[PDB]
Design a protein around this ligand. Sequence first.
Ligand code: HEM
Ligand SMILES: *[C@@H]1O[C@H](CO)[C@@H](O)[C@H](O)[C@H]1NC(C)=O
Ligand SMILES: *[C@@H]1O[C@H](CO)[C@@H](O)[C@H](O)[C@H]1NC(C)=O
Ligand SMILES: *[C@@H]1O[C@H](CO)[C@@H](O)[C@H](O)[C@H]1NC(C)=O
Ligand SMILES: *[C@@H]1O[C@H](CO)[C@@H](O)[C@H](O)[C@H]1NC(C)=O
Ligand SMILES: *[C@@H]1O[C@H](CO)[C@@H](O)[C@H](O)[C@H]1NC(C)=O
Ligand SMILES: [Cl-]
Ligand SMILES: [Mg+2]
Length: 327
Amino acid sequence: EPGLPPGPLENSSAKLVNDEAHPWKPLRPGDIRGPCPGLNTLASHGYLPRNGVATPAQIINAVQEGFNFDNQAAIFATYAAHLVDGNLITDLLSIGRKTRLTGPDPPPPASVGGLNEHGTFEGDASMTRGDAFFGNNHDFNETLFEQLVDYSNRFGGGKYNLTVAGELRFKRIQDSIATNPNFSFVDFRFFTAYGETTFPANLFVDGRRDDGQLDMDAARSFFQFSRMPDDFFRAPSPRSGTGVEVVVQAHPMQPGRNVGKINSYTVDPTSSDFSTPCLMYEKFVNITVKSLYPNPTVQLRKALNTNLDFLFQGVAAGCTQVFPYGR
Ligand code: HEM
Ligand SMILES: *[C@@H]1O[C@H](CO)[C@@H](O)[C@H](O)[C@H]1NC(C)=O
Ligand SMILES: *[C@@H]1O[C@H](CO)[C@@H](O)[C@H](O)[C@H]1NC(C)=O
Ligand SMILES: *[C@@H]1O[C@H](CO)[C@@H](O)[C@H](O)[C@H]1NC(C)=O
Ligand SMILES: *[C@@H]1O[C@H](CO)[C@@H](O)[C@H](O)[C@H]1NC(C)=O
Ligand SMILES: *[C@@H]1O[C@H](CO)[C@@H](O)[C@H](O)[C@H]1NC(C)=O
Ligand SMILES: [Cl-]
Ligand SMILES: [Mg+2]
């Protein structure tokens, strides 16, 4: 059916998104927020359900409407997250912690852990969240945010921009290598870790300006409080990871991992990287999804195949679809 998954916006102009129909509200008891400042902000303004549990279609519509996230990027991220962290039978995903609100769980080894689940979507060297190894991969960390402010002062004239992103991304990688014996920086996380550092410059900057320079009040508002600036206009066109190549090239890194000790970063020659986007997709579906759903029942297999078809619609690179559970 058309509109499943949601298609691109009919009208993708800049407009007021912090409007009277979408007020910021504080959390009620039980409301879930997680490691994504974008989704957190959409939930706290009511572009998504305010309790932080949503369907993939709700998430895709929200990121497009609220931030002008581009359609393919929205589809890929949402169905990737849903496949590994969401309930495929009830069609619900938590944007944070695991919750009974996503419905009766599937059999092990599937975890349905929400976006807080480490190593599926969420991973190491986040800008404002700590690595899961240290015990909290989802809450805003003030010390890490102050480092973002310091890098913005040093490389962005007090604003966050792609130059700042290139330097901060590398700093966070180096700090995880030095401190986290389980540091993993391969495949899907290698991709998302770099792309996410562009998002504040591309999507948190008011759309009437759209100059790639994010002020620190706005940065704190999104990253800490899940709140849009007063009178915030979304970006004037659909985008996501514009300029990711600049961030990647600031300090070229190979994908790899620490091997159970600090300072043991070992390149993984089997990992995808930005030269092999189709390999990233194929490994995600053949390996990561299969590790959660190795031998699904008929009902789960059907749900997997539908969501995998939707995932493939989000692949922006020139790739062939693969079928880990046949056709
Ligand atoms: C389209 C659906 C999306 C999903 C399911 C999603 C989910 C996630 C998840 C699970 C993370 C954790 C990655 C990590 O370990 O650092 C993350 C990172 C992030 N996402 Fe999203 N995201 C989405 C779209 C967006 C959008 C539209 C924005 C901005 C408008 C955004 C901004 C961010 C930022 C800034 C980070 C990194 C935060 C940090 O490192 O401190 N995301 N996302
Ligand atoms: C598109 O939306 C913008 C902002 O709401 C508005 O200025 C413009 O007139 C709209 N165009 C159409 C054709 O609806
Ligand atoms: C580190 O990795 C090991 C796998 O060898 C795992 O058992 C352990 O839970 C990880 N530690 C933390 C704190 O996440
Ligand atoms: C916040 O991050 C800093 C810098 O990595 C870390 O030293 C500190 O333990 C983190 N705070 C919490 C509560 O984990
Ligand atoms: C970041 O800001 C600095 C200082 O204003 C500027 O020199 C640099 O060109 C900016 N980078 C980008 C990508 O806008
Ligand atoms: C994924 O599985 C398909 C067969 O279903 C195969 O053609 C493809 O090469 C596999 N890709 C990887 C990276 O394992
Ligand atoms: Cl689009
Ligand atoms: Mg993380």
